[PDB]
Amino acid sequence: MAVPFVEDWDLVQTLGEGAYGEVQLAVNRVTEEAVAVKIVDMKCPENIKKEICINKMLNHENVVKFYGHRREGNIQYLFLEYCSGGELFDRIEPDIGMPEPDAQRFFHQLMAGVVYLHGIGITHRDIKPENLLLDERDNLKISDFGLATVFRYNNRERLLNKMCGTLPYVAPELLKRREFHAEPVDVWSCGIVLTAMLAGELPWDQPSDSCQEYSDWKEKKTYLNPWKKIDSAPLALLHKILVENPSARITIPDIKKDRWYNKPLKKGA
Numbered sequence: 713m714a715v716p717f718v719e720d721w722d723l724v725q726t727l728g729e730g731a732y733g734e735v736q737l738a739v740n741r742v743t744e745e746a747v748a749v750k751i752v753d754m755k756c757p758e759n760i761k762k763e764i765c766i767n768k769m770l771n772h773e774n775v776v777k778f779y780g781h782r783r784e785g786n787i788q789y790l791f792l793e794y795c796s797g798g799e800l801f802d803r804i805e806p807d808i809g810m811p812e813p814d815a816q817r818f819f820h821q822l823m824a825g826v827v828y829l830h831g832i833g834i835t836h837r838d839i840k841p842e843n844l845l846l847d848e849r850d851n852l853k854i855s856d857f858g859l860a861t862v863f864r865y866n867n868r869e870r871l872l873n874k875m876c877g878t879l880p881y882v883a884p885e886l887l888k889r890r891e892f893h894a895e896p897v898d899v900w901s902c903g904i905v906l907t908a909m910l911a912g913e914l915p916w917d918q919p920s921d922s923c924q925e926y927s928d929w930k931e932k933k934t935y936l937n938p939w940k941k942i943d944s945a946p947l948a949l950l951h952k953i954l955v956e957n958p959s960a961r962i963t964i965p966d967i968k969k970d971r972w973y974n975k976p977l978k979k980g981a
């Protein structure tokens with residue numbers, strides 16, 4: 713009775729969506745802490761044990777947090793950090809976006825976690841608003857790593873070649889290169905999220921020259937949408953992130969030294 717009941721987590725509101733389905737909400741029975749519980753099947757692995765193995769690495773307040781998992785046979789109960797704020801996705805007004813300051817804030821915290829993960833040599837590989845969560849105090853938390861993978865290990869980097877993520881966010885070299893560096897791809901996806909945060913619409917369908925939109929951008933025709941909606945400062949920033957050559961793109965270390973990234977905008981409380 714060192715307990716009693718405490719590890720009884722009641723199933724409730726269905727948070728839904730990926731990976732594939734479903735992540736539930738879990739009030740605890742005794743203390744009713746709230747937790748994110750992702751529900752997975754035997755029908756994966758071993759892709760699961762990978763997600764769970766990575767998820768046991770993450771320790772940052774901008775990265776969703778791991779607690780454990782119950783085996784329950786061919787159903788895995790994933791115990792993950794809960795955020796009440798919901799998807800950053802749902803904070804972007806369509807065709808509008810949001811207040812530059814709110815956007816810059818959210819972006820720092822995104823850079824925060826993405827620097828961190830890259831820190832420990834991991835890449836998320838599907839950064840998008842549906843995947844960037846917000847707690848009660850609107851703090852961005854990167855979630856879902858069933859897709860994230862190890863790219864550095866023992867100091868040595870690995871070039872990725874697997875195509876994955878989400879077309880509108882995925883960077884160009886994912887579509888034109890056999891192998892690529894993991895980090896430049898996460899920056900682009902982050903840049904794209906900045907566009908959507910400052911524009912409330914996505915720039916293009918895929919980073920294919922085959923896309924009228926993508927070509928105009930590489931034309932510099934930034935009187936078109938969305939860049940038209942975007943102010944000059946951050947638009948100077950997206951001009952460095954959304955750089956087709958992954959070797960010429962901006963690096964997060966330099967993104968930290970960008971005029972707009974370091975322009976004062978938002979107040980707290």
Ligand SMILES: O=c1[nH]c2ccc(Cl)cc2c(N[C@@H]2CN3CCC2CC3)c1-c1nc2ccccc2[nH]1
Binds near residue numbers: 729797855
């Ligand atoms: O708090 C969460 N923690 C997670 C930890 C890991 C994973 Cl894979 C998902 C979530 C996760 N859901 C993904 C975020 N999105 C929906 C389900 C799931 C995939 C895409 C939430 C969440 N909290 C919410 C609060 C309100 C509304 C939804 C919410 N989802």
